[PDB]
Amino acid sequence: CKPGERKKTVKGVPCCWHCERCEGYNYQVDELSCELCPLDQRPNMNRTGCQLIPIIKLEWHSPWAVVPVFVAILGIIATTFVIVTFVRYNDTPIVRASGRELSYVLLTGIFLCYSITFLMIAAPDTIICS
Amino acid sequence: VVDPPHIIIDYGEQRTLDPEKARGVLKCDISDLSLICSLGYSILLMVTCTVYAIKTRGVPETFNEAKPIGFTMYTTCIIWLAFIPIFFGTAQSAEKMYIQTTTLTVSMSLSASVSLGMLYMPKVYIIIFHPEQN
Amino acid sequence: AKPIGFTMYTTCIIWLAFIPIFFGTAQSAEKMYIQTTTLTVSMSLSASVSLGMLYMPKVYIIIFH
Ligand SMILES: O=C(Nc1ccc(Oc2ccc(Cl)cn2)c(Cl)c1)c1ccccn1
């Protein structure tokens, strides 16, 4: 029997066994029976071993990420411009009538929304979920 | 305090008959119920603010900024009322994670843009382009 | 101006919500049901939004005032 084939012997005749290729998620270490690779890894090409299953994530250069990142950059630039414009003209009547403190709180909220878009896109390395 | 954040590699949960197609997915807990629970308090604040805006229509115009507030609140409520069915409808799908991430990020960006624009941009425009009436 | 802006905004939100629910589905037996219901409800919602934001106030004033 070739590698990856399992031996079964006819009763009464030690000679001329039968071969059998087992299945997709099994590997043959006994040369007479084929075991099973755990959920982590995957049977090797030779059908007598195991190989690790590849891991996938969300990548920065994918189409799923180019649009939200673009929007976040544009929004952050706009909010920074607004904040600086308010800072320069702090004593003018319009800003004084805008409700300054709560306006600054709202601006912080907008900035935080864009930043959390960045965070959600970034990566799963423990502290990021924190 | 209850449970420190940890990552999970779903080495399974997408097991196919072809061993070549097998893929693990890297994530960190953050199940759907967690998203709903973490967003619930903010959504409740939203709803009560919209209720007060509904109850305060009609002003001698001395109390300005009420009319822009109403428009902002209606817009944001429409956004999130549309968000809910997408989250509850793509639950069983082949690319659930990508759609959910994109939906959440887009929704938050849209809400921030609506508030920022409709509550601040006229003031900036007047301040720079027309200094005579500041 | 305001009714037209509101109509555009709401219709755009409806269709941007339609795209992910329609093109991503559980690829199971009930796929035709889900897709048909989603399409029909989206189209009806858009029509109702236009009718409500452009014509209902005028009819209300004409009949009741
Ligand atoms: O996220 C939103 N809309 C959206 C639109 C297009 C999208 O693109 C795709 C691409 C492929 C597939 Cl299968 C499915 N959706 C995706 Cl993910 C999402 C949205 C819309 C209205 C209000 C709030 N949020």
Side-chain angles (χ1 to χ4, degrees), chain A residues 1-7 9-10 12-20 22 24-50 52-130, chain B residues 1-12 14-16 18-19 22-91 93-134, chain C residues 1-26 28-65:
Chain A
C1 298
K2 268 77 67 178
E5 270 82 2
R6 199 203 67 72
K7 179 178 283 186
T9 295
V10 193
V13 178
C15 300
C16 53
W17 39 95
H18 302 214
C19 312
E20 164 190 3
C22 283
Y25 288 168
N26 290 87
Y27 76 108
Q28 184 175 2
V29 72
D30 192 54
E31 265 68 43
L32 295 174
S33 176
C34 59
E35 282 204 327
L36 180 137
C37 295
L39 283 72
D40 183 19
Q41 69 275 17
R42 176 259 315 272
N44 187 9
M45 183 278 288
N46 71 46
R47 280 294 174 267
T48 180
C50 301
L52 282 72
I53 299 185
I55 310 102
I56 69 185
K57 57 171 99 164
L58 190 149
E59 308 171 355
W60 283 101
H61 51 89
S62 58
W64 302 99
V66 298
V67 180
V69 166
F70 195 44
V71 173
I73 290 165
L74 289 195
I76 277 178
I77 301 299
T79 313
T80 298
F81 179 59
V82 166
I83 286 164
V84 174
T85 295
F86 267 46
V87 165
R88 310 168 306 179
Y89 308 95
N90 189 359
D91 308 291
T92 61
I94 285 179
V95 190
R96 291 185 38 260
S98 297
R100 297 159 74 178
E101 311 91 4
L102 297 186
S103 299
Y104 287 117
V105 180
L106 195 52
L107 291 178
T108 54
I110 299 150
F111 197 109
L112 286 193
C113 292
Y114 294 129
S115 299
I116 193 66
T117 287
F118 273 127
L119 271 178
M120 278 295 276
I121 286 283
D125 57 1
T126 294
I127 70 166
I128 277 180
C129 313
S130 313
Chain B
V1 170
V2 63
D3 186 19
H6 52 89
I7 76 178
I8 297 89
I9 301 175
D10 304 333
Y11 274 128
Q14 211 259 328
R15 202 169 191 169
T16 65
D18 291 331
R23 291 294 137 87
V25 176
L26 182 46
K27 37 165 294 185
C28 65
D29 200 358
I30 201 67
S31 72
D32 296 351
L33 204 54
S34 304
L35 277 297
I36 296 306
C37 293
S38 192
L39 267 291
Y41 187 50
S42 289
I43 287 176
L44 192 55
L45 280 165
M46 188 163 75
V47 171
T48 311
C49 179
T50 309
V51 175
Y52 267 125
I54 301 299
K55 188 173 173 66
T56 191
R57 333 159 300 180
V59 159
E61 302 303 286
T62 317
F63 311 111
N64 63 310
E65 283 184 352
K67 211 167 65 82
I69 277 167
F71 304 153
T72 310
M73 302 315 294
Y74 305 156
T75 295
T76 288
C77 290
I78 288 164
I79 279 182
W80 292 101
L81 183 63
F83 159 86
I84 297 169
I86 307 158
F87 206 82
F88 283 163
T90 56
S93 172
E95 65 183 1
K96 174 197 198 148
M97 91 161 292
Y98 295 123
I99 292 175
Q100 294 196 339
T101 299
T102 293
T103 301
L104 207 64
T105 53
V106 162
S107 308
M108 280 187 177
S109 281
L110 270 171
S111 313
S113 292
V114 160
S115 289
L116 171 81
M118 171 165 39
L119 278 175
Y120 294 89
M121 294 296 172
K123 294 180 176 67
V124 181
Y125 158 87
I126 287 296
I127 282 173
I128 296 89
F129 297 180
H130 294 268
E132 67 272 347
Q133 65 183 177
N134 194 359
Chain C
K2 293 187 286 185
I4 291 174
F6 265 97
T7 306
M8 183 177 176
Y9 182 73
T10 316
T11 309
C12 283
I13 291 299
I14 292 168
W15 285 110
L16 286 167
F18 162 84
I19 290 174
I21 309 178
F22 186 80
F23 278 98
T25 311
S28 66
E30 296 88 4
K31 198 193 168 72
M32 294 298 291
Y33 286 97
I34 289 170
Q35 287 186 311
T36 309
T37 315
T38 310
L39 190 41
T40 55
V41 160
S42 294
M43 261 298 319
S44 290
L45 272 193
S46 80
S48 307
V49 170
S50 296
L51 183 63
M53 293 180 183
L54 292 169
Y55 286 96
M56 282 277 136
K58 308 195 186 219
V59 176
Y60 168 53
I61 301 299
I62 293 171
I63 291 176
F64 278 115
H65 294 268

